CSV table of C-alpha atoms in Angstrom, one decimal:
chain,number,residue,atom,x,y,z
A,1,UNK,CA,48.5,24.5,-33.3
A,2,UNK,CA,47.3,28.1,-32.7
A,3,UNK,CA,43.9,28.6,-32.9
A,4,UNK,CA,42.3,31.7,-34.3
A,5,UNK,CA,40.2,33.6,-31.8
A,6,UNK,CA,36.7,32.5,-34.4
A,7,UNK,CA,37.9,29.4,-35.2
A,8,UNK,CA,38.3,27.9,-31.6
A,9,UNK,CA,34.8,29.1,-30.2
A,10,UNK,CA,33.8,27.4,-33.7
A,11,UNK,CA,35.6,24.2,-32.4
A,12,UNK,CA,34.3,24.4,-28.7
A,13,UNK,CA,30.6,24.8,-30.0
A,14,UNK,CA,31.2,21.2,-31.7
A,15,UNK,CA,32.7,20.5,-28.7
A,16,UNK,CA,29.5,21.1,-26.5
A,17,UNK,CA,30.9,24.1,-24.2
A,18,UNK,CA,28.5,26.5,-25.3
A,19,UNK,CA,26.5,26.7,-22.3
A,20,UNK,CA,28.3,23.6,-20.5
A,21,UNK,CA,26.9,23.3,-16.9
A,22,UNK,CA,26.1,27.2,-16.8
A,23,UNK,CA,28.5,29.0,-19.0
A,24,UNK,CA,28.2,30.8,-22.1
A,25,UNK,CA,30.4,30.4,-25.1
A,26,UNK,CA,33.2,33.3,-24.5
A,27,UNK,CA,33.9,32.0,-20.9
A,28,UNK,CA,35.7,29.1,-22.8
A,29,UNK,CA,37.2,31.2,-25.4
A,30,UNK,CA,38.5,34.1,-23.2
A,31,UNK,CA,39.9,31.3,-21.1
A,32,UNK,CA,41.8,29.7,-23.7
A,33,UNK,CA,43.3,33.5,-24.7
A,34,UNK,CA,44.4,34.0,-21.4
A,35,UNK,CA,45.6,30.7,-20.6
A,36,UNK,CA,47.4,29.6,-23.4
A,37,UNK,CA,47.2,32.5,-26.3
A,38,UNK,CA,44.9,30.1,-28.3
A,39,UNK,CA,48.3,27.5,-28.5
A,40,UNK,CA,47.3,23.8,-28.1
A,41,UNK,CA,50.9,22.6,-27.3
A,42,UNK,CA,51.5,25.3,-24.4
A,43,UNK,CA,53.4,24.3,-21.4
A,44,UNK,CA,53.9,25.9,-18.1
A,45,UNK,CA,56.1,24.1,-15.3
A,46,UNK,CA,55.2,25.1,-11.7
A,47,UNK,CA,57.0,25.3,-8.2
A,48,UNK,CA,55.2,22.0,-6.8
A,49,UNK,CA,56.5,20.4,-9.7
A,50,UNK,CA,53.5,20.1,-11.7
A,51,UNK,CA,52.5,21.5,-15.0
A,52,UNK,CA,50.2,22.8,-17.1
A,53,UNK,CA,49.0,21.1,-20.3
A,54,UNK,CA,47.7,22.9,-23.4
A,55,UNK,CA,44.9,25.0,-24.3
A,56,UNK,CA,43.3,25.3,-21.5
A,57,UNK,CA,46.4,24.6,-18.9
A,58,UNK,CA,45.2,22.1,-17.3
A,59,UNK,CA,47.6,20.8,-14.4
A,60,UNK,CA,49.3,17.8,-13.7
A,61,UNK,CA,48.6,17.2,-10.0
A,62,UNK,CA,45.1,17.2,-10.0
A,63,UNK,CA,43.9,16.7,-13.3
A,64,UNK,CA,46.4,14.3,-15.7
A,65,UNK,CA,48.9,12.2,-15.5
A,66,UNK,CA,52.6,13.1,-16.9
A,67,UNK,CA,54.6,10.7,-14.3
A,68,UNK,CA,56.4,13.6,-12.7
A,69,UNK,CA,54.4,14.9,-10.4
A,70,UNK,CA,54.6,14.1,-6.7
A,71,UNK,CA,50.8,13.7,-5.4
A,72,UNK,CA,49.3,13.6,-9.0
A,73,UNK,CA,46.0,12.4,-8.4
A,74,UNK,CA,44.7,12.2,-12.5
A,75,UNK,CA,40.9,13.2,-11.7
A,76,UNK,CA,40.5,13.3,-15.7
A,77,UNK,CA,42.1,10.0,-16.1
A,78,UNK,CA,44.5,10.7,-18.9
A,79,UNK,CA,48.3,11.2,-19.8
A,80,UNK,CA,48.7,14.5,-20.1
A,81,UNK,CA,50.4,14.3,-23.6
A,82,UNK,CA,46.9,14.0,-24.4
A,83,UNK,CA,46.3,17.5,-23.9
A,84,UNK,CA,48.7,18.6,-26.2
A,85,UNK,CA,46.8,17.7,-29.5
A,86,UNK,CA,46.0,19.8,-32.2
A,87,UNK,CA,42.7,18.2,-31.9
A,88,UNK,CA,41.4,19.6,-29.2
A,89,UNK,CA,39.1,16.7,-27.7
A,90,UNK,CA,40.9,15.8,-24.6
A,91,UNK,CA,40.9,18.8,-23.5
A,92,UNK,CA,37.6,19.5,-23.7
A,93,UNK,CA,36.7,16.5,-21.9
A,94,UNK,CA,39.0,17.1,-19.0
A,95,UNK,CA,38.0,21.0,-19.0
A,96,UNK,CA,34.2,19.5,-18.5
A,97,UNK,CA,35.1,17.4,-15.6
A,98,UNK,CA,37.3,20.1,-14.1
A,99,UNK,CA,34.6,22.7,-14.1
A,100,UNK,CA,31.8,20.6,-12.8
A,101,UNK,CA,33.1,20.8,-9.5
A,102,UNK,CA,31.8,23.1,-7.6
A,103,UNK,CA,34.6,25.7,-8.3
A,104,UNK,CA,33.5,26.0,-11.5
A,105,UNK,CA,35.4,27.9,-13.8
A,106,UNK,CA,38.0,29.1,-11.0
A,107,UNK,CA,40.0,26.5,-11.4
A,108,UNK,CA,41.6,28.9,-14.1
A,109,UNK,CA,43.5,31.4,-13.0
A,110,UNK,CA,43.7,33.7,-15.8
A,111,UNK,CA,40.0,33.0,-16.4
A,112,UNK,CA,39.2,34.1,-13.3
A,113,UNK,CA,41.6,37.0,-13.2
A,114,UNK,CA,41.0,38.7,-17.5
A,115,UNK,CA,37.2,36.9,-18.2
A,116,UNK,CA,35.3,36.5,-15.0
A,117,UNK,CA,33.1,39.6,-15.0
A,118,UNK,CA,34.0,40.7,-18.1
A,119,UNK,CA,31.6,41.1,-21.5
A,120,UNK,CA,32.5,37.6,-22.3
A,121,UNK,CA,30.0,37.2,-25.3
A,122,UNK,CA,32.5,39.6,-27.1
A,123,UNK,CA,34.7,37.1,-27.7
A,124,UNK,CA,32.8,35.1,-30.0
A,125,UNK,CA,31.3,38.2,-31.4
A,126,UNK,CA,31.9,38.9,-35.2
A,127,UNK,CA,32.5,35.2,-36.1
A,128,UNK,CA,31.1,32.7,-38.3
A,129,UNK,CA,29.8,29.8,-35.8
B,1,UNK,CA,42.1,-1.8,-11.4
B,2,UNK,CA,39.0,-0.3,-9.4
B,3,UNK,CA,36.0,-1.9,-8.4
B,4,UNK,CA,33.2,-0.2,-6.3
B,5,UNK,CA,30.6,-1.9,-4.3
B,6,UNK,CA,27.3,-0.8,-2.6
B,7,UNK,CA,25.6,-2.4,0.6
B,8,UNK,CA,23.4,-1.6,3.3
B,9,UNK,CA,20.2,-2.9,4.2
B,10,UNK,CA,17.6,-4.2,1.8
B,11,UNK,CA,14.0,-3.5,3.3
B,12,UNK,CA,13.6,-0.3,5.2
B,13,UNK,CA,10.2,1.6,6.7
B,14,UNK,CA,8.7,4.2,5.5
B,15,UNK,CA,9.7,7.5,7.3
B,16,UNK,CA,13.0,6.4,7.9
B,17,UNK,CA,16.7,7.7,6.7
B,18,UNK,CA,17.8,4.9,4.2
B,19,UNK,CA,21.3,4.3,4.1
B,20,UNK,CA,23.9,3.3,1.7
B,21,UNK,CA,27.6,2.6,1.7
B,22,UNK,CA,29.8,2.1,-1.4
B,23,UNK,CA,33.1,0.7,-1.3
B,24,UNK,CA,36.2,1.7,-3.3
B,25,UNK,CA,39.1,-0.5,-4.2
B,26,UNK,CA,42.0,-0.2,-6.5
B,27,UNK,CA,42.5,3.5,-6.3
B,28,UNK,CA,41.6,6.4,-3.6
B,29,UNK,CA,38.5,8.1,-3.6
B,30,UNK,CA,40.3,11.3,-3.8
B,31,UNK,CA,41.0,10.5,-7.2
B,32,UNK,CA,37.5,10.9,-9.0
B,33,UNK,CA,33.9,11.9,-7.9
B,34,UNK,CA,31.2,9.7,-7.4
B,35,UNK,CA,27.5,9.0,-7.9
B,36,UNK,CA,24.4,7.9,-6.9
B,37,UNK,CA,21.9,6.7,-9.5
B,38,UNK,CA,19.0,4.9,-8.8
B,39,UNK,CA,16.5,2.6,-11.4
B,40,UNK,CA,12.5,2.6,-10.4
B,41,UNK,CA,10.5,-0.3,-11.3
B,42,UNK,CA,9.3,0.3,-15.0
B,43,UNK,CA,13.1,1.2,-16.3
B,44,UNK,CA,13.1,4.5,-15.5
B,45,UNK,CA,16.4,5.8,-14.4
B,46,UNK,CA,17.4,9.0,-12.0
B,47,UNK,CA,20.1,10.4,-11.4
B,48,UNK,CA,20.7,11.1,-7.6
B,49,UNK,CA,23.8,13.3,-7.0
B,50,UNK,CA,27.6,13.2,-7.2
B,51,UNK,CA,30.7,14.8,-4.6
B,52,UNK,CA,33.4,15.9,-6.4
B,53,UNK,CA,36.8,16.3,-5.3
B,54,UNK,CA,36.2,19.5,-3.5
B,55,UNK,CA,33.8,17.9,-1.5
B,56,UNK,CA,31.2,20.6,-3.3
B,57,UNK,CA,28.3,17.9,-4.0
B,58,UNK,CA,25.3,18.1,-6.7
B,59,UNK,CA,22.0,16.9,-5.5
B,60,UNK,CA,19.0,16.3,-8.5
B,61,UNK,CA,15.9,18.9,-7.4
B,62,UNK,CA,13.7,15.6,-7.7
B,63,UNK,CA,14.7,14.5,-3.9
B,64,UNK,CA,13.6,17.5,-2.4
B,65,UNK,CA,16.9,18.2,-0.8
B,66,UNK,CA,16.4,14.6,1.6
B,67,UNK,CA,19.7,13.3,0.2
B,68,UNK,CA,23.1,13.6,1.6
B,69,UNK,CA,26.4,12.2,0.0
B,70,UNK,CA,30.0,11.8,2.1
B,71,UNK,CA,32.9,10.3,1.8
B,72,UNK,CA,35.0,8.5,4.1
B,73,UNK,CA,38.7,8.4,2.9
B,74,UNK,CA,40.4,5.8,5.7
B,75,UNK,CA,37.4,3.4,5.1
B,76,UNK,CA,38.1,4.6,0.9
B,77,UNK,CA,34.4,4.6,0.9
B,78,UNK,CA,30.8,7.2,0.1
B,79,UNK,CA,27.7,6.8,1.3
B,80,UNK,CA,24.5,7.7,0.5
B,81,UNK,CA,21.7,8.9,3.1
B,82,UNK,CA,18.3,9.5,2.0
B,83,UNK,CA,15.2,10.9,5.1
B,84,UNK,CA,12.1,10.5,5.1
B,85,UNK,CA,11.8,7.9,2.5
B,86,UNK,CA,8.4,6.5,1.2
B,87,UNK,CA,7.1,3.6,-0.7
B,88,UNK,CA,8.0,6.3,-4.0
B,89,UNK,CA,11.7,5.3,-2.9
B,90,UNK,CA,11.7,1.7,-3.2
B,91,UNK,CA,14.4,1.1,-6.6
B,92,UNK,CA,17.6,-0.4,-7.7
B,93,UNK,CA,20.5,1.9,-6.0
B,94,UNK,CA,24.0,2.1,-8.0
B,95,UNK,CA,27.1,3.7,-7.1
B,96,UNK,CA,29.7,4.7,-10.0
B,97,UNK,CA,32.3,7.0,-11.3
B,98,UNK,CA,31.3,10.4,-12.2
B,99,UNK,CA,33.0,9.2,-15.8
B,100,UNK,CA,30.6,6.3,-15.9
B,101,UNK,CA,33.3,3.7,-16.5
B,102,UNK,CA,32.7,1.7,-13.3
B,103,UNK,CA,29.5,0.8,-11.8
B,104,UNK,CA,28.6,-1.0,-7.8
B,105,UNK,CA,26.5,-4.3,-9.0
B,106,UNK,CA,23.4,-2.6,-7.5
B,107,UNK,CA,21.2,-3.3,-4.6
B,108,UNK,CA,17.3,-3.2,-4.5
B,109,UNK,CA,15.9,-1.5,-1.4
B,110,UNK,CA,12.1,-1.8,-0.9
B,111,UNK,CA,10.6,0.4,1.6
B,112,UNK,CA,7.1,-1.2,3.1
B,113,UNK,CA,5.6,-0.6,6.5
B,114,UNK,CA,5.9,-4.8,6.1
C,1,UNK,CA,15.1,20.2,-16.2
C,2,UNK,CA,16.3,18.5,-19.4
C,3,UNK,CA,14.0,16.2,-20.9
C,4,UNK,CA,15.4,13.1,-23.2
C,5,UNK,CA,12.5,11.4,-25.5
C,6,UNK,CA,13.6,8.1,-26.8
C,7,UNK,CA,12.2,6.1,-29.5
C,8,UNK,CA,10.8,3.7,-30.2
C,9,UNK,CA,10.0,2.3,-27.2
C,10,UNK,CA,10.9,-1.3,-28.2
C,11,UNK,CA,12.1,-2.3,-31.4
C,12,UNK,CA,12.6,-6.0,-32.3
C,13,UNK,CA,15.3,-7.4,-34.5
C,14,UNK,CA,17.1,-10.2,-35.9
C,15,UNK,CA,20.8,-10.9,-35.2
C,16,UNK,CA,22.9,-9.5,-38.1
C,17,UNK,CA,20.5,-6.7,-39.0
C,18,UNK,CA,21.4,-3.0,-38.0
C,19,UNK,CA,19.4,-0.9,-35.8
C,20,UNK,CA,19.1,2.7,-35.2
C,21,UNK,CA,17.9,3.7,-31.5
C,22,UNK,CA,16.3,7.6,-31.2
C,23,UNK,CA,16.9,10.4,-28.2
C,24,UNK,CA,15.8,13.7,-28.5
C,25,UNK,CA,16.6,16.5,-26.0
C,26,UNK,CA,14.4,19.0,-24.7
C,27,UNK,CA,16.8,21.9,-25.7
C,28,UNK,CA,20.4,21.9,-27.3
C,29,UNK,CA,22.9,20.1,-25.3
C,30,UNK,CA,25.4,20.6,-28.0
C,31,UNK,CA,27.6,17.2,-28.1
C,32,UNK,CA,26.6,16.5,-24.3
C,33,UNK,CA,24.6,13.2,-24.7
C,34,UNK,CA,25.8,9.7,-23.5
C,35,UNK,CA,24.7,6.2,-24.2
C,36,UNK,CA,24.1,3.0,-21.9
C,37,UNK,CA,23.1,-0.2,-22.1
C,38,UNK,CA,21.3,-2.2,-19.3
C,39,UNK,CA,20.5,-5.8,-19.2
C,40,UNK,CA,18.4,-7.4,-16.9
C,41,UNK,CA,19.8,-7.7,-13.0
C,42,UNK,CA,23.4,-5.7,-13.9
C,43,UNK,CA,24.5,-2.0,-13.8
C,44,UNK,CA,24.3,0.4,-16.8
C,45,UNK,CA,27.6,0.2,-19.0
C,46,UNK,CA,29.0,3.3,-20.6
C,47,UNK,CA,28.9,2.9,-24.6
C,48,UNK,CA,29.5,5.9,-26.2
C,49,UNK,CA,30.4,9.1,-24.3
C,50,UNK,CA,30.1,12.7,-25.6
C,51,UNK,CA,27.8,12.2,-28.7
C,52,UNK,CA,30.1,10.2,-31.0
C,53,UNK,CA,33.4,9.3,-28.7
C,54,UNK,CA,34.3,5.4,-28.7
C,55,UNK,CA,34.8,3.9,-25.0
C,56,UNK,CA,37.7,1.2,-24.8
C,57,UNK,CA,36.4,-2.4,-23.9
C,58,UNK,CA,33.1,-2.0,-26.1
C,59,UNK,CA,32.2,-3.4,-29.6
C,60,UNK,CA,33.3,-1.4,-32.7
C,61,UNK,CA,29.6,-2.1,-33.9
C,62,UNK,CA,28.2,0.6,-31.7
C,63,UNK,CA,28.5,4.5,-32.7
C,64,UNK,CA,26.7,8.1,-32.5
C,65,UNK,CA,26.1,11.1,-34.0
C,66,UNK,CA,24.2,13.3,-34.1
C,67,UNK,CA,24.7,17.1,-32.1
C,68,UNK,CA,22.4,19.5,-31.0
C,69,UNK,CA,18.8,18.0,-30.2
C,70,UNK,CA,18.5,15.0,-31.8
C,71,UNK,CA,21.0,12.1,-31.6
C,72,UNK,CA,21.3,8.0,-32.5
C,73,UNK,CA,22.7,5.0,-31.5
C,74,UNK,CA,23.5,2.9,-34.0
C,75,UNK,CA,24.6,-1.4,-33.6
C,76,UNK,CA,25.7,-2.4,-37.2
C,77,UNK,CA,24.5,-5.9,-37.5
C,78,UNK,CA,23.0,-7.2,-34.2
C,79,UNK,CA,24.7,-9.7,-32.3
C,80,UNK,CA,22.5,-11.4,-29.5
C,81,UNK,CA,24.9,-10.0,-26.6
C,82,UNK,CA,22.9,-7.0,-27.9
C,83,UNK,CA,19.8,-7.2,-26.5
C,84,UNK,CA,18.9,-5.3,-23.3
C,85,UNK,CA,17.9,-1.7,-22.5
C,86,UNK,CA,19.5,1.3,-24.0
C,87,UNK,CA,19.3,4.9,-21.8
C,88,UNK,CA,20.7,7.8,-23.7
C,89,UNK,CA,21.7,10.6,-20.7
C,90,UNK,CA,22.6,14.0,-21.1
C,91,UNK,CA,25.5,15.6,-18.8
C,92,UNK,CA,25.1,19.1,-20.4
C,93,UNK,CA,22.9,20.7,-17.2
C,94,UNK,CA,22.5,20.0,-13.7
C,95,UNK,CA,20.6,17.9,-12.7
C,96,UNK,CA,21.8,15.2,-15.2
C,97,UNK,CA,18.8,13.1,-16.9
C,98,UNK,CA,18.2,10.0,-18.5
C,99,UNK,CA,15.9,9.3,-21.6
C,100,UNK,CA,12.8,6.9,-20.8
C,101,UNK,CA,14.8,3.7,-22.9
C,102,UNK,CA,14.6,1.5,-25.6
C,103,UNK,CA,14.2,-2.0,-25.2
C,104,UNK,CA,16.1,-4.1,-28.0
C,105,UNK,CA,14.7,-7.4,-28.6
C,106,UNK,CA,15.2,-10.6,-30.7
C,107,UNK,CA,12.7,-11.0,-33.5
């Protein structure tokens, strides 16, 4: 499923990530834009063999488990075929364990590279929530 | 499966560092981040701190910055250190999962100048 | 810090009647509240996790709602396994915090 850009901070409001352990709303939202383009069944193999899972690409050595990944460790305790629902619950719980470490947020790239010190209210500006 | 365990001494004295150990098996410690929570008498629950897998840690405010959480990964074990403890201190101490899936069986520590 | 208010304090029951247990947050935690159950000399047992989310291993009897500030824990018909403390906890903000409880009893 691609999510719209209203309809997915809509979603992660039920979800609980509006101002989950310190950030706002568009942190999630700009994350998801530049991680997966708003696509729940995006998939991105890496060079250590891992890979990362949906939305919000989470990977498959630290975070889930998709049995082909040398030192997989699944901190979030789930197959990573979870994370490629158009329901986006899994992910969201993963995303909340991953970014209550003390890295917070960093542990996206592209989050950390298009949305980290940007206005990132803007992207749930204009939308119905 | 995994099954976590807490022990350590039972009475300590007041003005002393208390000290807890909590025992992993079935899985590595590297795998998940764990907790300290602790129950007063009176069923009133607090939440002590958590080490995630960074080793960045979370202590609660409420403990005045006298705790300490580390892990031990040859021993697959975290422990808990607590200074200057008081008779305010004496409670039910639990290790678990930051998930909240598997709990130690808990251990009462009474701090008395007895 | 986050402050969880749970009512009643104790509520008495008879098995195979449903309850209804209260927690209200402090400030909106969105879908960030958890419940446990304690009884008497054991550890706290997850029961439901984000809100409304069913844990594996636990009686289909229990379920939440609610989102926001105010939330529930409901047991359809009360079976006496039941009866024990119930801590609602909110993960939403460091440091994490626990509601005062709810003591379930028989009637």
């Amino acid at each position: 499923k691609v999510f719209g850009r209203c309809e997915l901070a809509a979603a992660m409001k039920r979800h609980g990530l509006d101002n989950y352990r310190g950030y706002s709303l568009g942190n999630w939202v700009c994350a998801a834009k530049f991680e997966s383009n708003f696509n729940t069944q995006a998939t991105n193999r890496n060079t250590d063999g891992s890979t990362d899972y949906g939305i919000l690409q989470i990977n498959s050595r630290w975070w889930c488990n998709d049995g082909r990944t040398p030192g997989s460790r699944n901190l979030c305790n789930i197959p990573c075929s979870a994370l490629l629902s158009s329901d986006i619950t899994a992910s969201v719980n993963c995303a909340k364990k991953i970014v209550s470490d003390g890295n917070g947020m960093n542990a996206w790239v592209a989050w950390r590279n298009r949305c980290k010190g940007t206005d990132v209210q803007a992207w749930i500006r204009g939308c119905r929530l | 499966d995994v099954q976590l365990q807490e022990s350590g001494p039972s009475l300590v004295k007041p003005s002393q560092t208390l000290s807890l150990t909590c025992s992993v098996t079935g899985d590595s410690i590297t795998s998940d981040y764990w907790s300290w929570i602790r129950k007063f008498p009176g069923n009133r629950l607090e939440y002590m701190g958590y080490v995630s897998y960074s080793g960045s840690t979370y202590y609660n405010p409420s403990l005045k910055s006298r705790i300490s959480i580390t892990r031990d990964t040859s021993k697959n074990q975290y422990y808990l250190d607590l200074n200057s403890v008081t008779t305010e201190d004496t409670a039910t101490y639990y290790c678990a999962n930051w998930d909240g899936d598997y709990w130690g069986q808990g251990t009462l520590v009474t701090v008395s100048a007895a | 810090d986050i402050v969880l208010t749970q009512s009643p304090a104790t509520l008495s029951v008879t098995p195979g009647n449903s309850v209804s247990l209260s927690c209200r947050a402090s400030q909106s935690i969105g879908n960030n509240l958890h419940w446990y159950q304690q009884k008497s000399h054991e550890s706290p047992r997850l029961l439901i996790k984000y809100a409304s989310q069913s844990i594996s291993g636990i009686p289909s009897r229990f379920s939440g709602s609610g989102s926001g500030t105010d939330f529930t824990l409901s047991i359809n018909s009360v079976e006496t396994e039941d009866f024990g403390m119930y801590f609602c906890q909110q993960a939403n903000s460091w440091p994490y915090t626990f509601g005062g409880g709810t003591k379930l009893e028989i009637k």
